[PDB]
Every structure is written in structure tokens, then in C-alpha cells.
């Protein structure tokens, strides 16, 4: 039963990245101001925060099994910090242009970064953060990268060139390129995590969200209702819903069978930029970052 409760919300500078820790009740936010924050959303006290840089930090993920966070910023750098001590673990120039998105492999010591330099890069932390591969082919900014959780030897990249490319690690060309028909670009791509559907979802400045069958490459559905750029759309990992967020200031919760909107939320933090869902669905938590702060919600 959908019963949305605000578990914790705080104001800050614009939140561009956000992520949940899988075992501590913590959320990481990465800010346009160069600051990152880790909050305990149950006690409502900061665990740790760092002034990383003076440029925006658009991307940040926990790497829980190593006690790290990894972040990427407009100064072209990837940094990794130990969240227990604050210590900086590594600091390197990853691309010659902004970093939009970082994904962490669930099982292997790999990280993907996607950038305005038109590539995705694969880094290996068990090989001194060596660059192991550069995936070339996109023709505008790479806005989003995400591993297929059912087969993390493959990953999807979403691009302002209006395509999604799906790639295999260790192979230089995409397995396939999806021509989205989202003419203003793709801001975000996400996989449905369960084995019953081979689905991906994309979000666009053209105000649409689209569901794809990645076996047949067909568009299964198009979800309309947002009134400004759609920054993200994801499938909830346990509940039968899709969650999206937009520069129109709303989050929307859509029924994932009927693709109809169930609930529209204006949390009143202005434009929405990023999303995370709790990996194990603890309290069905989701969190979103906005112009004016973040919010952590229990969906029921």
C-alpha cells in the first residue's frame, strides 16, 4: 500500500548526485558547490562531509565493500574517499571534460565514468585505478551509465545524441544502439532489476519517459505528464512502480503495469536532479536531490 512519509529532508546547495548506503542508514549527496555530505537519515545527523572541490560534483556513489565513496566533478577529476576517516584514497583526472555519471560494478573492482568527452571509461581499483578501456561511439555528452544488474558484464550509456548504447566489457563496439526518438537527448537510463522483463527506461528533456525491451529494441510505452526536463526515471527494485523527477519540481510515481501516474509530489525544493532507491528496499526508501536540498521518503 502506497503511503508516503517524509523521513528526512534538509536544505543545501543544489544536489546533483545522491546514493544510499546498503547497510547503514546513510545517504550521500553531491553538490553543485563542490561539497559532498553523508547524512544518517534516521538520526538526522551528518556522518561526514567534505569540501571536495570548488566545481560541481555531479556524480557520487558508495563503494560499501571498500568503505569508500567515489565522486566525479566538473574539474575533470574522480576522487575516492574513505567515509570512516575522511581520508582521500585516490585523486586523478579521468576525462578532459565534465563527468556526468559514475557506476560501480556489483562484484568486480570496476567503475564506469561517463563524460562530456563523448566516452565511457572503465577503471580498475585492483590495478591502481588503471584505465582498462574507453568505450567510444557516442556523439554528444554521455549523461548516464548503468550496469545491467542481471548481467553486469554489460552496461548501458545514455547520451544527448538521442541514443542508448549497450556495451560488453572487453568489446570495443556496442552490442546495439537504441534510437530513442527522444529528440532532445537522453538524460538517464536504468534497468528493471527483476528477471521477468528485459526492460530499460530512458528520460529526456523532451518531457517523455520511455520503456524499452532490450531483446527486441522496441518501445514498450511512453509515459507523459511532466512539464519540464525529465532528469531521471527508474524502476523501483521491489515495488511495481517507476519513479521519475523533473525540472518541473515534481516527483511522479507511476504504476509499472498500466504506466499510469499514481501520485505526483511537489516537495517544494524546486528542480529535481537525481534519485536513489534503497538497494534492499529497506522501508521502501527513496531519496531525491533538488535545487534546494534533498529528501528521503519511505513509500510505505
Amino acid at each position: 500500500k502506497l503511503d508516503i512519509k517524509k523521513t528526512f529532508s534538509n536544505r543545501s546547495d543544489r544536489v546533483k548526485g545522491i546514493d544510499f548506503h546498503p547497510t547503514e542508514p546513510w545517504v550521500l549527496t553531491t553538490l553543485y558547490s563542490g561539497r559532498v555530505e553523508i547524512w544518517n537519515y534516521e538520526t538526522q545527523v551528518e556522518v561526514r562531509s567534505i569540501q571536495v572541490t570548488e566545481t560541481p560534483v555531479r556524480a557520487g556513489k558508495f563503494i560499501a565493500r571498500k568503505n569508500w565513496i567515489i565522486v566525479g566533478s566538473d574539474d575533470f577529476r574522480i576522487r575516492v574517499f574513505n567515509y570512516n576517516t575522511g581520508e582521500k584514497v585516490v585523486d586523478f583526472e579521468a576525462h578532459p571534460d565534465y563527468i556526468r555519471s559514475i557506476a560501480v560494478h556489483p562484484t568486480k573492482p570496476y567503475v564506469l565514468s561517463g563524460s562530456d568527452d563523448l566516452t565511457v571509461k572503465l577503471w580498475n581499483w585492483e590495478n591502481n585505478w588503471a584505465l582498462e578501456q574507453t568505450f567510444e561511439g557516442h556523439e554528444h555528452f554521455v549523461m548516464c551509465v548503468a550496469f545491467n544488474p542481471k548481467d553486469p558484464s554489460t552496461f548501458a550509456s545514455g547520451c544527448l545524441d538521442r541514443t542508448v548504447k549497450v556495451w560488453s566489457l572487453g568489446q570495443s563496439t556496442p552490442n546495439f544502439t537504441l534510437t530513442t526518438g527522444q529528440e532532445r537527448g537522453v538524460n538517464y537510463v536504468d534497468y528493471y532489476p527483476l528477471p521477468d522483463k528485459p526492460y530499460m527506461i530512458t528520460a529526456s528533456d523532451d518531457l517523455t519517459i520511455k520503456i524499452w525491451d532490450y531483446q527486441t529494441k522496441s518501445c514498450v510505452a511512453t509515459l507523459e505528464g511532466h512539464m519540464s526536463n525529465v532528469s531521471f526515471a527508474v524502476f523501483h527494485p521491489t515495488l511495481p512502480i517507476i519513479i521519475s523527477g523533473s525540472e518541473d519540481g515534481t516527483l511522479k510515481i507511476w504504476n509499472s503495469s498500466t504506466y499510469k501516474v499514481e501520485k505526483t509530489l511537489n516537495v517544494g525544493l524546486e528542480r529535481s536532479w537525481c534519485i536513489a532507491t534503497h538497494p534492499t528496499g529497506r522501508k521502501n526508501y527513496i531519496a531525491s536531490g533538488f535545487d534546494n536540498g534533498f529528501t528521503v521518503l519511505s513509500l510505505g
Binding site: 543544489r14 553543485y32 556526468r100 555528452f141 549523461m143 544527448l160 528542480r271
Partner: peptide, 5 residues
């Protein structure tokens, strides 16, 4: 820059 914000 596109997508500056």
C-alpha cells in the same frame, strides 16, 4: 555549455 546546471 549545454546542461550547465
Amino acid at each position: 555549455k549545454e546542461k550547465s546546471d
